Design a protein around this ligand. Structure first.
Ligand code: R0Q
Ligand code: CL
Lengths: 298, 302
């Protein structure tokens, strides 16, 4: 029993964190095989003009108490790739994956190439992450683990004026309409990840929290008319299919659980909580719920 | 900016997780130097958990009865001893991944990271607190026994908890790494119940200062309070008494924000009275009590 916001074990990623310094800027890098990946703003904007003026020895790369020698450099979108002479012996099995809004991942927050904390978070529908970052956290990475393969999905680049964060995938493509430049940027209006709230309601049922259940059902269209009114993302037939296993395990049809969600949105919780929370949690996917309520290991 | 429930990076602990099997029971062990630490109930069977005599069950065991697996490698057990509710298996190989470590016993209200494991394999990491009733609100399934709680100060891992059991309310009970249980619990399946739980007041105050540091002041008021009047009010909402030690511990956060501890206490009294009125504090509609004053300073400053 119990339901916590759980992150993946960070060990395979800790063995890849390095410190990258260029001039007066110090941030974090990801050392995989013989390449160090980091935000291109470390050179700071005409990046392939600021970069032309740089030589290999301008980039100081530190892996623990060891200096790595930079033997090459190239830019891919908003990521700088520093070719180093030494392949990382702790390089895990890995892939670079681009995630969709609503998908969750673990973040290993780092300062000076040293990991300080690990937390779980979700890519918001407005493409920002509600992270916990300070100056020097740039280059910190987001990831998932499947069996023994680390899927790198995020690299931190900046904080927006509302305190939320913006970054890229590991190929340097930003999530959202953001640019790596000090300019007037703002996160768009955010919405609640409906499929994730439903998954968390199934996790509550599995944990013996059933007060919100009711005898009612609803249509997908009727539910989306209500959900669009409460700034909730539309629920697609794909989400309904993804929730199938949890529906079969608990005996509560997905549209049966949607009628619970509609009543919670129109009437509130009335002094009651669900899994120790007075708000509807949207940062657990259906897969996160199945993984935690079955104990999958890595 | 931002305030998350943050766990310590688990890598230094992952490299210590092993699988311990004795008979038909399989659970997790912590391999540090040439010793594997695990719950002593790994020697118990079906009609054993009500009233086990661990000294009697252990005297019948030989070193080769304990199967220890580190990854795809079998470790050879060359000795065994019991220290309180922990079994210590001496092995023939020192763990080359042994980090710098200490065994520390924590007090209620202290937080720590848990690396949840099954079959010596880590599955997840989460942050939690030792409740005032000495239980932890963890996320554990059957086979997670032997999973550990820890903190990391610079490069030293402080092991503070080992998981042993789930109580009937879904909460968890365990020991420190010397096998002394936290709370009035025993490693027996006899009828046991967690005492009435309370809110960790010093932690709620620390989290209110974290909200001020991140720019939120909506909950402050022009009032102050005496420590005694605050405690008379706090007890009525099932909050732990706030001691002078707690007031001294909050000193740095009070100095940083310019809000005296007893002024913040007056604001907490008002929140308890009014509720949040559709608002949140740091993305939460409930008062958070699983961040210590030390966690707040670490996450907001470094
Ligand atoms: C050989 O005996 C065991 O292995 N006993 C484990 C056991 C226990 O609580 N295991 C579990 C621990 N944590 C989460 C759990 C989630 C669901 C189910 C079991 C869980 C079994 C039940 O009663 C006792 C009594 C005392 C003690 Cl110290 C341990 C236990
Ligand atoms: Cl302590």
């Amino acid at each position: 029993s119990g339901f916590r916001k759980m992150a993946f074990p960070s060990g395979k990623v800790e063995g890849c964190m390095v410190q990258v310094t260029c001039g007066t800027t110090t941030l974090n890098g990801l050392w995989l095989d013989d390449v160090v990946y980091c935000p291109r703003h470390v050179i700071c904007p005409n990046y392939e003009d600021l970069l032309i003026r740089k030589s290999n020895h301008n980039f100081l790369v530190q892996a623990g108490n060891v200096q790595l020698r930079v033997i090459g450099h190239s830019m891919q979108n908003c990521v700088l790739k520093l070719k180093v002479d030494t392949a990382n012996p702790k390089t895990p099995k890995y892939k670079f994956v681009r995630i969709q809004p609503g998908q969750t991942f673990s973040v290993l927050a780092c300062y000076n190439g040293s990991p300080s904390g690990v937390y779980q978070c979700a890519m918001r529908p407005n493409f920002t992450i509600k992270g916990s970052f300070l100056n020097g956290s740039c280059g910190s990475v987001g990831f998932n683990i499947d069996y023994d393969c680390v899927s790198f999905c995020y690299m931190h680049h900046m904080e927006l004026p509302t305190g939320v964060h913006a970054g890229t995938d590991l190929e340097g493509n930003f999530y959202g309409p953001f640019v790596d430049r000090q300019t007037a940027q703002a996160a768009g209006t955010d919405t609640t990840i409906t499929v994730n709230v439903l998954a968390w309601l199934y996790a509550a049922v599995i944990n013996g929290d059933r007060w919100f259940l009711n005898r009612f059902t609803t249509t997908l269209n009727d539910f989306n008319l209500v959900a669009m009114k409460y700034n909730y993302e539309p629920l697609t037939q794909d989400h309904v299919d993804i929730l199938g296993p949890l529906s079969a395990q608990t005996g509560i049809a997905v549209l049966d659980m949607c009628a619970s969600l509609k009543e919670l949105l129109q009437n509130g919780m009335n002094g009651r909580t669900i899994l120790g929370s007075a708000l509807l949690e949207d940062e657990f996917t259906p897969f996160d719920v199945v993984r935690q309520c079955s104990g999958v290991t890595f």
